[PDB]
Symmetry: C4
Subunit: 192 residues, 4 copies
C-alpha cells in the first residue's frame, strides 16, 4: 500500500504547488488528469529500484513491458534481439494529453517517438494525417539534424516512448545497418 | 499543509546550521528574511514535481508564471511564442536582497538577468542608473564573452530570472535572429 | 535494525512495482532471489556513507573488502599497492544469477569483470571454457576497442567487480606499465 | 535538535554498515572518531541548504567561515577580495586523521590543500619538514601537471580545504596574475 501512499502524498504536494502559483481551475484539472493517466494512482522510486538491479534484470523488465510494442513493429520484430534490447533500454516513457503539441514544425528536433498506444495528428501546408499504435515519428530530424518537417499533436491520450538523438546515434553506432529502416520511413514520408 | 511543514522543518535545519557555524545575529536575520521573501513560508520538491510532468505541462506552467514579465518586454511580447517558451524554460528564479552585488564590474560574466519585480542600481566611473520591472541586464558579456562593464546592485528586494551564457547561446542557436534584440540594447548602453 | 527496515520497506516497493507491471510469478521469484543474494536482507545509503568519509577511509574500506580478491590475483598481489587501490576504487560490485548473459559475443565491449566468487562459462564457435574465483574477463575489448570475442554467461551465482573502459584507461594513465598484464592475458586467450 | 538526530541516526547506519562488512574493532573506532571530529555530532543537508540560498549569501557564508584562514595567508589577505571569494567558493572542507597519507609521492596530483588547522609532515629521500595553520601544499602538480614531488601525511588531526586542479585553473582564468603567488612557493620548494 506504500505505492498508493506515495502517490497520494505526492499529489497533495502538487495541489499545494498549483495553489501557490495560483493556477486556473481548468489547468489544475488538466494536471490532475495527467497524473491519473501517467501513474494510475501509484508511485515508486523507479530510478532507485532499477538502479538496484543489474543489467540482465533491467533488460528483462524493459523487454517484458515492451513485448507488444515490439511484436507490432517489423523494425523490432524482425531485428537482432540485442538491437531491440539496446533500443528499448534507451527509451523514455511519456504521456501526452489531447491537443498537446508533441512536435512543432520548424523547430530543431532532438528526439523521436514510438507510439505504444494512442493517435497523433501529423500536419505538414495542409493534408492532416494520422499515426497510431505501432508507428513512430520524429525520425527525419534525427537523421537530417535539421528542422521539424511537420507538427505532431496528440489526438487521443498518447502513451509514447521517446528516444533522444544522442541515444539514437549511440545505438546505431553498434547496429549501423539498422539506420536504413529509419531512412526508408523518412524517405517515404518526405516524398509524400 | 505539507508544504508549510516542509518549510518550517527545513528552516529549522537552517537555524541549526547557522548556529553551528556561529553566524552573527544580523546575518541570521538576513538569512531569515531571504527565506521569507524567497519561499513565502512554503516549500515543495519543485524539481521532482516538474520532473514528473511532461514537456507540454512544464511549458504551460512557465508561460503562466511569466505571463506578466512577457507582456512587459517587447523582446518577448512581439516574438515567436516558441522562442519565448524556449527562453522561459531556461530561466532560473532568484531573489536578491537590498545592497546585494548581482554583478561586479571587471569580472567574467556568465549570466544575464530579467527583472520580474524590483529595482537595481547600475554603476559604470560614476553616473548611477536604475533599471526596474520589465528590463534586463548582463547581456553585454554574454555577447562579448569579455568582462562586466558595470556593477549592478539590488536597490530594493529583487525578484529576477537569470539566464546562463550557455543556455542563452543554445536558445539563439534555434532562434539566431533574436540575438539582434540583445545587441541593440548592448550597443545603446555601450554608447552611453 | 534500521538497515533491515530499509531493506524490508524497499523490497515492498519492489513487490508493488512488479505487481504494477504485472510481471510473471517466475520472474518475481527471480527478482526476489537477486535482492536476497545481492543485499542479504540489509540496505544502507552506501553512496551517502562513503561520500561522508574521506579518501583515506574509503581506500582502507575497499582494500579491506577486497583483501582476498587481491591476494588471489598476481595482477594485484605483486603490484604497486597504490595501483591496486587506484583500481579497487573504480570497481563496481555486481551480482549475476545463473544463466545470465554477462557478455554477449559481437557487441561493443565497454567493461571487464573480476570474479570475486562464482563460475562463468565462456563460449567462443564451440569449446566452452570455465573461469572462477581469482580470474577476470572482458579485457580484450577494453584493449582493442572492438567487439566481444566470446559470450560469457554466469554458471553459478556470480559476485563480480566490473571496471569501465574509461576507468580502466584512467588508472593505466597513471600506471602505464600495468597494461601489459592485461595484454598478456588477452594475447594468450586470442591465440587459443 | 533535528541536526543531532540526523547525526545519531546516520551514524547508526554507519555502525550497521561496518558490522555488515565485518570491519575490525580498531577500524570501527577510527571511523567513529572521524565522524566525531568531522561533524561534531551534528548533520544538516548542507548541499540542500546552500542550494536554497543565492550567490550573495553563499559567498558571505564561506567568507565568514574562512575569515581566519584568509587573514593568516598573505595570498588571500593582500589579494583582490573578489579573487578570495572566487577561491573560497571552490574549496572542499576535508578532515584527515593522524598518519593519513594526504599526498603520495610519485602519483598524479589533481588537488592542493590549504591548512585551516593542523600539522602535516612533508617527506621529499629524507629530511622531513612540517607545515601548519596558514600554509598550503600540493600546488606543484597543479602547476606542472606532473607527479607529486613529495608525500604528505597528517601529523595531527588536520582540518583542510582542498582545491581541484580544474577549479584552480578556472579561478586563475579570471585572476591570471595570482598564479605567480603559487609559482613562487613552488619554485622555493623545488630549489630546496
Ligand atoms: N514530412 C513529413 N513527416 C511526416 C509525415 N508523416 C509522418 N511524419 C512524421 O512527422 C514528423 C515531424 O518531425 P520530423 O520532421 O523530425 O519527422 C516527421 C515524420 O516522422 C509526412 O507525410 N511528411
Ligand atoms: N556598460 C553599461 N552597462 C549598462 C548600462 N546600463 C545598464 N547596463 C547593464 O549593466 C550590465 C553589467 O554587466 P554587463 O557588462 O555584462 O552588461 C551590462 C548592461 O547589461 C550602461 O549605461 N552602460
Ligand atoms: N576470445 C577468447 N576470450 C576468452 C577466452 N577465455 C576467456 N575469454 C574472455 O571472454 C571475454 C569476452 O569478451 P572480450 O572479447 O572483451 O574478452 C574475452 C576474454 O576476456 C578464450 O579462450 N578466447
Ligand atoms: N618538492 C617539495 N615539496 C614540498 C616541500 N615542502 C612542501 N612541499 C609540498 O609537498 C607537496 C607534495 O605534492 P606536490 O609535488 O604537488 O607539491 C608539494 C609541495 O606543495 C619541499 O621542500 N619540496
Amino acid at each position: 500500500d506504500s505505492s498508493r501512499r506515495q502517490y497520494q502524498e505526492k499529489y497533495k504536494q502538487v495541489e499545494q504547488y498549483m495553489s501557490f502559483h495560483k493556477l486556473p481551475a481548468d489547468f489544475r484539472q488538466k494536471i490532475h488528469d495527467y497524473y491519473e493517466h501517467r501513474y494510475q494512482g501509484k508511485m515508486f522510486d523507479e530510478d532507485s529500484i532499477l538502479g538496484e538491479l543489474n543489467g540482465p534484470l533491467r533488460e528483462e523488465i524493459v523487454n517484458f513491458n515492451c513485448r507488444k510494442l515490439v511484436a507490432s513493429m517489423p523494425l523490432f520484430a524482425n531485428a537482432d534481439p540485442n538491437f531491440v534490447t539496446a533500443m528499448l533500454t534507451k527509451l523514455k516513457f511519456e504521456v501526452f494529453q489531447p491537443g498537446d503539441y508533441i512536435i512543432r514544425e520548424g523547430t530543431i528536433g532532438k528526439k523521436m517517438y514510438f507510439i505504444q498506444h494512442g493517435v497523433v495528428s501529423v500536419l505538414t501546408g495542409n493534408k492532416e494525417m494520422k499515426l497510431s499504435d505501432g508507428s513512430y515519428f520524429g525520425e527525419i530530424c534525427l537523421l537530417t539534424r535539421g528542422r521539424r518537417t511537420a507538427s505532431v499533436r496528440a489526438d487521443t491520450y498518447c502513451r509514447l516512448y521517446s528516444l533522444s538523438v544522442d541515444n539514437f546515434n549511440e545505438v546505431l553506432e553498434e547496429y549501423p545497418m539498422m539506420r536504413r529502416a529509419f531512412e526508408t520511413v523518412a524517405i517515404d514520408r518526405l516524398d509524400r
